[PDB]
């Protein structure tokens, strides 16, 4: 389920390197017409029309792939249908006999679990959900919850939905029992990381995602590689350098991981960079990481220059605190950045309250002031008090 979703995302989000799109299109093509999934193939074809890299052939010319088939097609309706006939016919006879006899209360649930397979696979949302939800109402084993939990997940990646996926994720988790159980937790942990990186609080994501108790794969709820790279990468962006040397290069899981891959440039190169405190090293590496890991990813593409801007701020910041009367002519020349870049993105940082850098841009000199002061707390305390205040006027708008 995940490798299909992942390569459809990869496929559309391509504009560089031939073998990426080519190999993507082949796997999508092979799987999606074996599987009864028409509506995502459609979406794929909608989303990847009038793009570069086309593997669609209906009118195009913009193709750079060596596969000339990922268009929505009529062959689809012979492969899908003979399978759909077989599956509907088997399952119809099966549900009828099991439910008549009334043997057990656990054969009944196995009979409704078969329609949640069927239905997520064709891509119905609401039918899949309420067919399975029966099992939970006829809760008599915790199994019923495991089918509820698995189904929200499959559908989730396909659509790329945060909100009803969050809602259902919370409702099924919290429910009757709760438990430390392994793959309810693995699934809860990645998905919480997804959403909160999406809101842009970012710290909340970090609290669960960076931490992992899964040293091996969860297949279709995520690939081992995939979660692991994502945890290290959020690690870097949103946590301190005191945190980094604690936990994000000194957890024993990361150690078995850095063994064989260091192309993640964030389990190696950027972590080392951050520790060493450089900014002659850092910025080159970040761009290389952005291309190689963020833009292939389904989750970290959407956070673009924010991800860039805050990391360049964090590195400037750890330098700004360590020194005082600081020679901007010297920095701007030789810590690996251009002069023009350094001023204007430093100045871009300063009003937002992201640096207490005391600049003179062209006289070549920078000094430093403390990053917290009474004023800074007063300003943000005031921010939150009027946040609070507005919502009560809203309560007293509809009620009253």
């Amino acid at each position: 389920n995940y490798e299909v979703s992942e390569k459809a995302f990869l496929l559309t989000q391509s504009k560089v390197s031939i073998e990426q799109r080519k190999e993507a299109a082949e796997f999508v093509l092979a799987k999606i017409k074996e599987e009864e999934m028409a509506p995502y193939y459609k979406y794929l074809c909608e989303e990847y029309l009038v793009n570069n890299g086309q593997s669609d052939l209906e009118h195009d010319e913009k193709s750079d792939s060596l596969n000339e088939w990922i268009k929505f097609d009529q062959e689809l309706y012979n492969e899908l249908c003979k399978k759909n006939e077989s599956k509907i016919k088997e399952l119809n006879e099966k549900i009828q006999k099991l439910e008549e006899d009334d043997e057990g209360e656990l054969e009944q649930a196995q009979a409704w679990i078969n329609l949640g397979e069927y239905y997520a696979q064709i891509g119905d949302k609401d039918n899949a959900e309420k067919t399975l939800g029966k099992s939970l109402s006829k809760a008599i084993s915790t199994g019923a919850k495991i089918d509820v939990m698995l189904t929200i997940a499959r559908l989730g990646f396909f659509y790329n939905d945060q909100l009803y996926v969050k809602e259902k994720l919370e409702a099924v988790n919290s429910m009757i029992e709760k438990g430390g159980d392994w793959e309810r937790r693995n699934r809860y942990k990645t998905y919480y990381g997804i959403h909160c990186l999406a809101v842009r609080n970012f710290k909340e994501a970090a609290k669960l995602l960076v931490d992992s108790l899964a040293t091996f794969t969860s297949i279709e709820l995520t690939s081992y590689e995939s979660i692991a790279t994502y945890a290290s990468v959020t690690g870097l962006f949103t946590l301190e350098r005191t945190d980094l040397k604690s936990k994000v290069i000194d957890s024993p899981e990361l150690l078995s991981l850095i063994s064989t891959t260091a192309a993640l440039q964030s389990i190696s190169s950027l972590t080392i960079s951050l520790y060493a405190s450089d900014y002659a090293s850092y910025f080159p590496y970040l761009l290389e990481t952005y291309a190689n890991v963020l833009i292939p990813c389904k989750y970290l593409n959407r956070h673009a220059d924010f991800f860039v801007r805050e990391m360049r701020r964090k590195v400037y910041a750890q330098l700004l605190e360590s020194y005082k009367t600081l020679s901007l002519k010297s920095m701007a020349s030789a810590f690996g950045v251009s002069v023009a870049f350094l001023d204007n993105d430093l100045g871009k940082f300063i009003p937002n309250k992201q640096l207490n850098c005391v600049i003179d841009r062209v006289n070549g000199i920078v000094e430093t002031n403390r990053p917290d002061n009474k004023n800074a707390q007063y300003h943000l305390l005031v921010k939150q008090g009027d946040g609070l205040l507005t919502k009560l006027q809203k309560y007293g708008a509809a009620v009253r």
Binding site: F283, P284, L287, Y290, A304, D305, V308, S333, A334, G336, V337, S338, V339, A340, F341
Partner: peptide
Amino acid sequence: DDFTNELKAELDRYKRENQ
């Protein structure tokens, strides 16, 4: 944007060879 980071990359690379 996607474009900016590149423009900036190229500017940096040009400085760097003369650094």
